[PDB]
Write an enzyme that holds these catalytic residues in place. Sequence first.
Site, short mmCIF file in Angstrom:
data_model
loop_
_atom_site.label_atom_id
_atom_site.label_comp_id
_atom_site.label_asym_id
_atom_site.label_seq_id
_atom_site.Cartn_x
_atom_site.Cartn_y
_atom_site.Cartn_z
CG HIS A 142 -40.49 41.61 7.53
ND1 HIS A 142 -39.26 40.97 7.46
CD2 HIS A 142 -40.84 41.58 8.84
CE1 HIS A 142 -38.91 40.56 8.66
NE2 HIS A 142 -39.85 40.90 9.52
CD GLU A 143 -43.31 44.34 10.09
OE1 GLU A 143 -43.56 43.41 10.89
OE2 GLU A 143 -42.19 44.88 10.01
CG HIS A 146 -43.92 38.61 11.09
ND1 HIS A 146 -43.09 37.55 11.37
CD2 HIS A 146 -43.15 39.72 11.13
CE1 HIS A 146 -41.86 37.99 11.55
NE2 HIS A 146 -41.86 39.31 11.43
CE1 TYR A 157 -40.27 37.12 15.05
CE2 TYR A 157 -39.95 38.34 17.06
CZ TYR A 157 -39.86 38.26 15.70
OH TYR A 157 -39.38 39.34 14.97
CD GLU A 166 -37.93 38.70 11.87
OE1 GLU A 166 -37.34 39.37 11.00
OE2 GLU A 166 -39.05 38.96 12.33
CG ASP A 226 -33.04 39.67 17.70
OD1 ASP A 226 -34.16 40.24 17.64
OD2 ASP A 226 -32.49 39.14 16.71
CG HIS A 231 -34.84 40.64 13.92
ND1 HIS A 231 -35.35 40.68 15.20
CD2 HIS A 231 -35.86 40.98 13.10
CE1 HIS A 231 -36.63 40.99 15.15
NE2 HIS A 231 -36.96 41.18 13.89
C1 LIG Z 1 -34.22 48.00 13.69
C2 LIG Z 1 -35.42 47.06 13.61
C3 LIG Z 1 -36.48 47.66 12.71
C4 LIG Z 1 -34.98 45.71 13.06
C5 LIG Z 1 -35.85 44.51 13.47
N1 LIG Z 1 -37.22 44.61 12.99
C6 LIG Z 1 -37.54 44.34 11.72
O1 LIG Z 1 -36.71 43.99 10.88
C7 LIG Z 1 -39.01 44.50 11.35
N2 LIG Z 1 -39.90 44.30 12.49
P1 LIG Z 1 -40.47 42.76 12.81
O2 LIG Z 1 -39.32 41.80 12.80
O3 LIG Z 1 -41.58 42.36 11.93
C8 LIG Z 1 -41.16 42.85 14.52
C9 LIG Z 1 -40.14 43.38 15.54
C10 LIG Z 1 -40.80 43.66 16.87
C11 LIG Z 1 -40.90 42.67 17.83
C12 LIG Z 1 -41.52 42.91 19.04
C13 LIG Z 1 -42.08 44.15 19.29
C14 LIG Z 1 -42.00 45.14 18.34
C15 LIG Z 1 -41.36 44.90 17.14
N3 LIG Z 1 -41.62 41.51 14.85
C16 LIG Z 1 -42.87 41.13 14.56
O4 LIG Z 1 -43.72 41.85 14.09
O5 LIG Z 1 -43.07 39.85 14.89
C17 LIG Z 1 -44.39 39.34 14.54
C18 LIG Z 1 -44.70 38.13 15.35
C19 LIG Z 1 -45.81 38.08 16.18
C20 LIG Z 1 -46.13 36.93 16.87
C21 LIG Z 1 -45.35 35.80 16.73
C22 LIG Z 1 -44.24 35.83 15.92
C23 LIG Z 1 -43.91 36.99 15.24
C24 LIG Z 1 -35.83 44.35 15.00
O6 LIG Z 1 -36.92 44.45 15.61
O7 LIG Z 1 -34.72 44.13 15.53
ZN LIG Z 2 -40.13 40.40 11.46
#
Ligand SMILES: CC(C)C[C@H](NC(=O)CNP(=O)(O)[C@H](Cc1ccccc1)NC(=O)OCc1ccccc1)C(=O)O
Ligand SMILES: [Zn+2]
Length: 316
Positions: A142-143, A146, A157, A166, A226, A231
């Site tokens: 998933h990461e 991104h 985002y 997402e 969010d 999400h």
């Molecule tokens: C209870 C949680 C675990 C459930 C959910 N998370 C996920 O399911 C997994 N993390 P994730 O979704 O990968 C990440 C989330 C994030 C955003 C901002 C700061 C820290 C974390 N976004 C992310 O890495 O965005 C990448 C991106 C960068 C630039 C542009 C667009 C996207 C949650 O955070 O609610």
């Molecule tokens: Zn994500």
Amino acid sequence: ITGTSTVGVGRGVLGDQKNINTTYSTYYYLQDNTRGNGIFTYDAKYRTTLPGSLWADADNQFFASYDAPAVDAHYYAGVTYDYYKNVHNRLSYDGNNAAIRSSVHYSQGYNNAFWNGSQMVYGDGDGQTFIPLSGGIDVVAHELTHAVTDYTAGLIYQNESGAINEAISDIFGTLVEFYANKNPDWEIGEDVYTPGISGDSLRSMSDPAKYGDPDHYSKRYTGTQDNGGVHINSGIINKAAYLISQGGTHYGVSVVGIGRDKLGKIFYRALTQYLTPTSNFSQLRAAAVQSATDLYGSTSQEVASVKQAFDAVGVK
Ligand SMILES: CC(C)C[C@H](NC(=O)CNP(=O)(O)[C@H](Cc1ccccc1)NC(=O)OCc1ccccc1)C(=O)O
Ligand SMILES: [Zn+2]
Ligand SMILES: [Ca+2]
Ligand SMILES: [Ca+2]
Ligand SMILES: [Ca+2]
Ligand SMILES: [Ca+2]
């Protein structure tokens, strides 16, 4: 670092033994020279300064509790690299074999993981909501997805484009989990979420509403939490993708499944050739229909199933 490629052994977060590609130069480092320009895994040492220090180990054995998140971040980055290369002929996240960098032990009791525009970052969890999040192959993929999105469609985002962003990460996280073929499913995060509770997960693609997420456009979240529900509303697209692959009847609309491999081909083509930073759900439907037309022909079952799936979730 400059050194010679070696192979260490260790245990991951779930207690499974695996071999990992390392580099020897005085220490053994979590640096895999066999994939692109390398996979590099770092110790953030419970702080939030990044990346931290390239992971170094005296004996090339990684069986300590503290090692486990690093073992899995490193190994699952490699599996994800292999998926994109072998299945989509894509060399790392930028298509030019960019080095893949991950940090583990980020902060204290941090219940999340992310791509920050440069690298992947994993919390250890607080031990109740999560165990270290690199233990989930779907989370790692998933990461890394991104990053793929960052170098291709660039989906903003926020709101619908962020929910597509997402969903793309949940779709390819799941397809990587199937590729590795260890306990695959259409759930997200089940291997690291709630160690005290069996059978749950963060999100479900097959039934998003199991965890309160919408499975139809008429139920989309329209508020500001969010980042505008990125999400939450991902459930609408995740359900469509699930229907494309596996089929089913959803709100009275029947979808003929075409399988995971064709799902991946259609959405990879949409992501890399048609989606843009501001694409909304309707534009995603158009991109997926065009992609399946490119690959399979306008009169194909594959095109018909993409239309049915978006019909079923209310996206025209
Ligand atoms: C209870 C949680 C675990 C459930 C959910 N998370 C996920 O399911 C997994 N993390 P994730 O979704 O990968 C990440 C989330 C994030 C955003 C901002 C700061 C820290 C974390 N976004 C992310 O890495 O965005 C990448 C991106 C960068 C630039 C542009 C667009 C996207 C949650 O955070 O609610
Ligand atoms: Zn994500
Ligand atoms: Ca050791
Ligand atoms: Ca699984
Ligand atoms: Ca899963
Ligand atoms: Ca659980």
